[PDB]
Design a protein around this ligand. Structure first.
Ligand code: SF4
Ligand code: SF4
Ligand code: FCO
Ligand code: FCO
Ligand code: SF3
Ligand code: SF3
Ligand code: F3S
Ligand code: F3S
Ligand SMILES: [Cl-]
Ligand SMILES: [Cl-]
Ligand SMILES: [Cl-]
Ligand SMILES: [Cl-]
Ligand SMILES: [Mg+2]
Ligand SMILES: [Mg+2]
Ligand code: NI
Ligand code: NI
Lengths: 581, 263, 581, 263
């Protein structure tokens, strides 16, 4: 057993080793191991991506116009965000400018994804870490109604409703077919909601499971289908026709009416169901404002997103701010440049990849994806990992760093960046939110904080959906219908050799695609994805990533039941297919 | 009255088929889970993780040996001794074979489980392999598409539950009900195809009138699915209706049949 | 002025005349006139249909296979019921038996219509006679929540919801654009709901306006569209394919799943919103259990409906019983034969039609529709009527009688027939309903009763929807897919000369189509429609119809404000396009 | 801000267009009435009857003279001095003319108002006559169909409110947006038409595969409407999709073009 110091942590692999494989209520495949000391406190944390597909390899030799369709399939949870990054990257390489309505529609696509993804994460992925579903069976329906009505104007709050929900759960469990509730952590002492709050939460789980299907109808209108809508290089394929013959073959007034109806319902659900539930989880779990801080008080990163001026990716255009904080210095938000080779680099000394020199980090334009399964001594075999060896290579996830710093990305990161750049709406929202909880600002830098920021982002995005729709309708009133630029559609119009970067803020954090085009085909295509940052393994300096750091120093009540580990990991919304691509 | 046990496992995948499933409008995925099946194992949605999740997997396949439906999303990679996809420290393929041995039938959700999908596209770095090349002694229903249509997924489930039998299949193991006909055989733009009325570049006058997308690379003529009839997201749209050609996403090898924008 | 005695009434047209033209919150065109004495009691009531189109004339010379499509357009409110009666009539004439699935699907189409039509009538047509909309502005949202929650398990009951509904109404009226609420009867002393019940009812009005659009999706699946779905002679055109190639081109498992979803939602809305509102109106308006009795304690008629045995229209088959009561003898439910020339007859001595002898009635196989606009000695002129002359011709509505008797038809009529025939379900429902209001069974024979029975029937039909759906699925499981018989589709296969009767129970009561075919063409096509019965003018004996009787002896608080007249008329759910055709 | 005044009157009619309107899925008819327009007069829905209804009518057309939209459902009969349709003891046509005189624009909802529909079919006993043969001095927007599609009706209204203009029309005064193309030009069964794959008798194998309905009398080839694209009842179906040929119900004189089951 060894011990070393990094980022204010003592990494100590003495003591009992705990394995959680598989991590569930995530997308894709993850393994986590920790060591706990005699006080059942985590002294070592090991983040492991247990899948790889190799989209960066598959994309070589493809037509750049096709690339979005391939990379969209990096992930069906954050569906569309890779298509957006791709069309951005190819447009940036070739020098394509899209029409305003294409840009607006793309921002609608992204905001719709934020709303949908954040809502499903809150209920279906993270929720059962905080709601004791089985405890709901002990709730009083009238007391449940009273609680719900004290927290929200949401209509669906009758005692009879809560009784009906409870009775449905009772009949579901009675025969012993507990399905997704089988062998859960129910009764764990870290479950702190009263029974009425569990019944309210569970009811909302079911409402959200129903309601989420409606949100993506926006993607269906503009993008054909969800999951995995369609896009083009040069804008979007959803041609508009309001007032001419054949409007039946295009986005017309009836189609836009559908979109508006979805937007309103989406805002209503998020504002009156998800937001109150998030605050209620805060109220009953305040100690989790001091657990899982990890890198969120040291190093956070946003690239920024939602350019409001078409084809302008600058600071005055992006509605969601970009910037980096390092060394806990939130008074100096630094500018990010994705072309600068000294900024974003990926290391593979602790990952299953070959580099000519594994002691140096490679900017994505110099990226290499050469898979090498080499787990070394894992107390078993190459085909039977009993204990990863975190002193060597232990993951299919590359290790991204920014100026050599290990960074946290995602909703909390973005909230902190916007807050410290002085975004008025963010400042006001955060201050009000932490006031309502009777917690200091610092309480946001936590596992609880990640959940609160995610919910507040769902609300932000629902608001932006309306703003974007209004901008679209304004253009249509002014007779501006264009949805595609085709000046540079034909390969004969492209530079023989060019490269570009497409970036955005996906639901989980900062996303970049780096593409190099040569002779009409993709020569290089490298992706660095938010969960790649967060779930990162260590670097040559032994610096730990956001997940490992957040798990460090965490108390477990019951080592055999990893509820605290699940809470912190789920708070980051892990997407492992994204992380590995 | 007991509900049919379903075990849903995940190989190499993007989770689009799971996402599609929960989009179901009728029956709602809520009601499928609460009333129609017993979804007894599912990494995406289950409370239990790690050893608790292993305990559920082992108990279900033992207790309901011969009696559970196995749903498979994604595929096994044969590369690196299977360790391109690791579950409980061992190759995913081992979990697939264990689950398959006890299943009464297997549903191969999506192009991944059916054929290979994007990870199997050239040069297939992981040697991703469809389920029917690994499991050769069980009924496999292929439900291809990237992902399949939500209400098609739920319709296949309700068929199996209501009628207590597997859907009848074509020569490739696809349900005849939804894969018997081509996109192009039920496409509302066929009039334009017949008349030689084609979109020639994006957002041209033809595009604004809903003309046929064949010259923009539409693979509808060779693709079997229900997109042009059942449509997507409670009938709201489908790729062609929103102005993009069919990619061919239900067909074996569709990623490697040339550019989506060529003939 | 004259006075005479009929059916226990004193018809006296001395004293002040009141005119209500147009009658609103009905389908189509009606004029009502009354005389009131010094005590503001109606001593005379005059029912006048103020429209005619002449479908019976238009159908002559048409192909019998097309008839359903023409007569469907008798009415867009009771949409489909005339198509059903038409296909029944032509099948009866030609000797066609349809496959079981066609029969089941037709029963689904009819039950769907009962649900939709009854729901919309309750809220959008009758509701504002009972609910004081402007009084809702004075309600306390919390007391509204408490009221609603005391009456129902329905989820949408929060104080915040009622506040939001209340504020929507407040904003609507704030600009002085009161729309459908302008110049209403608000504040009339006969408005008896407390403000909280008004706000509850108004919230439900809005919810019902939204929800009704969903119910008719069942019509869209089986019949292509609503309003005015499609049908065929020989069954239904919605071919079924569950498990074969090309199921995408037919009624498949996904289409049946949609139907099931709508059925469950329809039952839930009726049972938890409409039913408790009907009872609440009952609780606050018990005196109306003794107003508007009319013929409902003397003469009531049902043909019966919903044959459960395909092509069997006998008593063992019909799920909704047929029968006639006369002379207030509910102990003697008499069988109805629609071929018997001494049973159903229409008189026109007081209608705008020509008969060879206007002093006798004609059975519909001998029917004549020879329009003759002759209002005779009116106050005013034939193009400017100030007062109809009820001593001569005063309506576009023919006067149907049953064995010479004036009959009431519709939900109350059917409820009485089924109750006294000993239908277990009807007896239980009525007993439980009248028990909850602490009213005697006789309290159903009233304006309030007509509304209670309508809500009852909506619940009954919602249950039958599931029953029929289950029967259809049972057949499909057994490999029984057939939806059409075509062995007699071609005209050359029909009798050279034949006649038939198609009958059912439409939402408003007993419907009959009588058709004669000769040489492949419609020779005669006579409709007798429920509102023809209820809104009937007088006959040669001076016998009054159901509306005129129900209005007799009615007290009016304010002569100039016809709220009591509207209450009683609306309770029968008048369809004037139906009545006149 | 004030909402645009709308006066909705009814001649000879079946009320199918009113029912269609309240089916609207987006925007909901509730939201149209509460938030987009001021529905100031409407026999089907208004609280006031008789003299109170007459007062509303008079007050609105006076106070908002030159400023309201007139919606007309149904048609005036010229027979029997117009007393085949009587309102307030007078021929309906007088109400129509009075309403028309103060209107900024007139929408003729449905085939009745646009052309005649069923009452005008041979032998037209009442001499039912479409609105534009009576009102000859105002813009009339024809929105035909029996009835028109719910979401077409609401889209036309939202267009007028959002864009502050009437929809552009064809030479018959139908909105180009929804009546510019034929049913048959956007029919999902066109593939079958093109291949000579036809239903020949009801519930034959062709019918069960969704073959073309041309030989069963489908009038899609000569009918302009949005039924095969926008579809009906929130996109759930349309006549052809549920197995019945188009009747031609959006076209002038469609009742008298021969049997619905003939060519
Ligand atoms: S758009 Fe595609 S599927 Fe439709 S007609 Fe054209 S080629 Fe065929
Ligand atoms: S069903 Fe009618 S509209 Fe469709 S292709 Fe055939 S003839 Fe044309
Ligand atoms: N959000 C998201 Fe998926 C991840 N990580 C991407 O990009
Ligand atoms: N219900 C109904 Fe219409 C009437 N009256 C018919 O038939
Ligand atoms: Fe639904 S996992 Fe998504 S990639 Fe194509 S089917 Fe695979
Ligand atoms: Fe909507 S009233 Fe119905 S008949 Fe044909 S349009 Fe007329
Ligand atoms: S791309 Fe796929 S989703 Fe349907 S339209 Fe083509 S099969
Ligand atoms: S009958 Fe009418 S509803 Fe559409 S499909 Fe034909 S125009
Ligand atoms: Cl799995
Ligand atoms: Cl493939
Ligand atoms: Cl009118
Ligand atoms: Cl016509
Ligand atoms: Mg990468
Ligand atoms: Mg008649
Ligand atoms: Ni993802
Ligand atoms: Ni009617």
């Amino acid at each position: 057993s060894t011990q070393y110091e990094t980022q204010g942590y003592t990494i100590n692999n003495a003591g009992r080793r705990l394995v959680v494989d598989p991590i569930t209520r995530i997308e894709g495949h993850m393994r986590c191991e920790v060591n706990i000391n005699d006080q059942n406190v985590i002294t070592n944390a090991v983040s492991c991506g247990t899948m790889f597909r190799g989209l960066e390899i598959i994309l070589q030799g493809r037509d750049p116009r096709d690339a979005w369709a391939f990379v969209e399939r990096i992930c069906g949870v954050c569906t569309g965000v890779h298509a957006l990054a791709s069309v951005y990257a190819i447009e940036d390489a070739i020098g394509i400018k899209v029409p305003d309505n294409a840009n607006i529609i793309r921002n609608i696509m992204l905001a719709t994804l934020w709303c949908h993804d954040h809502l499903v994460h809150f209920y279906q992925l993270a929720g059962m870490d905080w709601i004791d579903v089985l405890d709901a069976l002990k709730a009083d329906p009238r007391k449940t109604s009273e609680l719900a009505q004290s927290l929200s104007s949401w209509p669906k709050s009758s005692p009879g409703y809560f009784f009906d929900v409870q009775n449905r759960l009772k009949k579901f469990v009675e025969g012993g077919q507990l399905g997704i509730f089988r062998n859960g952590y129910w009764g764990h002492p870290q479950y702190k909601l009263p029974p009425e709050a569990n019944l309210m939460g569970f009811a909302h789980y079911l409402e959200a499971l129903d309601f989420q299907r409606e949100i993506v109808k926006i993607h269906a209108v503009f993008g054909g289908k969800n999951p995995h809508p369609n896009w083009i290089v040069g804008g979007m394929p959803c041609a508009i026709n309001i007032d001419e013959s054949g409007a039946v073959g295009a986005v017309n007034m009836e189609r836009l009416n559908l979109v508006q109806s979805i937007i309103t319902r989406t805002a209503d659900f998020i504002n009156n169901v998800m937001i109150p539930d998030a605050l209620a989880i805060g109220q009953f779990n305040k100690p989790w404002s001091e657990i899982g801080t990890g890198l969120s008080d040291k190093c956070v990163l946003s690239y920024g997103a939602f350019p409001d001026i078409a084809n302008d990716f600058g600071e005055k255009s992006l509605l969601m701010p970009g910037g980096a904080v390092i060394n806990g210095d939130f008074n100096n938000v630094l500018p990010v440049d994705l072309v600068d080779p000294q900024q974003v680099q990926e290391f593979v000394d602790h990952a299953w990849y070959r580099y000519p020199n594994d002691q140096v980090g490679r900017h994505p334009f110099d990226g290499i994806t050469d898979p090498w399964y080499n787990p070394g001594d894992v107390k078993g075999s190459d085909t039977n990992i009993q204990q990863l060896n975190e002193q060597e290579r232990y993951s299919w996830i590359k290790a991204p760093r920014w100026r050599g710093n290990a960074m946290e990305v995602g909703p909390l990161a973005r909230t902190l960046i916007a807050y410290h750049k002085g975004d008025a709406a963010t400042v006001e929202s955060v201050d009000r939110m932490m006031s309502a909880l009777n917690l200091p600002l610092s309480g946001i830098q936590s596992t609880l904080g990640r959940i609160l920021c995610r919910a507040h982002e769902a609300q932000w995005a629902a608001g932006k959906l309306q703003y974007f729709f209004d901008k679209l309708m304004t253009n249509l009133k002014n007779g501006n219908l264009a949805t595609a630029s085709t000046e540079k559609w034909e390969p004969a119009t492209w530079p023989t050799e060019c490269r570009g970067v497409g970036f955005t803020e996906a639901p989980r954090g900062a996303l970049g695609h780096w593409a190099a085009i040569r002779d009409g085909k993709i020569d290089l295509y490298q992706c660095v994805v938010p969960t790649t940052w967060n779930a990162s393994p260590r670097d040559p300096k032994g610096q730990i990533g956001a997940y490992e750091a957040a798990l460090m120093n965490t108390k477990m009540a019951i080592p055999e039941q990893p509820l605290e580990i699940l809470r912190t990991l789920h708070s980051f919304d892990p997407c492992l297919a994204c992380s590995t691509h | 009255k007991p509900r049919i046990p379903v075990v849903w496992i995940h190989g190499l995948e993007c989770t689009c088929c799971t996402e599609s499933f929960i989009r179901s409008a009728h029956p709602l995925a809520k009601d499928v889970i609460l009333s129609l099946i017993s979804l007894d194992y599912d990494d995406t949605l289950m409370a239990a993780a790690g050893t608790q999740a292993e305990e559920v997997f082992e108990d279900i396949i033992t207790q309901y040996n011969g009696k559970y439906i196995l749903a498979v999303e994604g595929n096994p990679p044969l590369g690196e001794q299977g360790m391109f996809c690791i579950s409980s420290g061992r190759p995913f393929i081992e979990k697939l074979k264990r689950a398959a041995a006890g299943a009464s039938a297997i549903i191969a959700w999506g192009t991944c489980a059916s054929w290979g999908c994007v990870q199997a596209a050239r040069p297939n770095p992981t040697q991703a392999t469809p389920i029917d090349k690994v499991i050769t002694d069980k009924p496999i229903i292929k439900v291809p598409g990237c992902p399949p249509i939500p209400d098609v997924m739920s319709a296949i489930i309700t068929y199996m539950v209501t009628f207590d039998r597997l859907p009848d299949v074509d020569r490739m193991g696809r349900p005849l009900m939804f894969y018997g006909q081509r996109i192009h055989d039920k496409c509302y733009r066929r009039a334009h195809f017949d008349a030689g009325e084609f979109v020639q570049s994006w957002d041209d006058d033809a595009a604004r009138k809903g003309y046929c997308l064949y010259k923009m690379g539409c693979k509808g003529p060779t693709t079997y699915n229900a997109c042009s009839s059942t449509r997507w997201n409670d009938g709201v749209s489908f790729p062609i209706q929103s102005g993009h050609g069919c990619l061919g996403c239900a067909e074996n090898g569709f990623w490697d049949r040339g550019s989506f924008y060529s003939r």
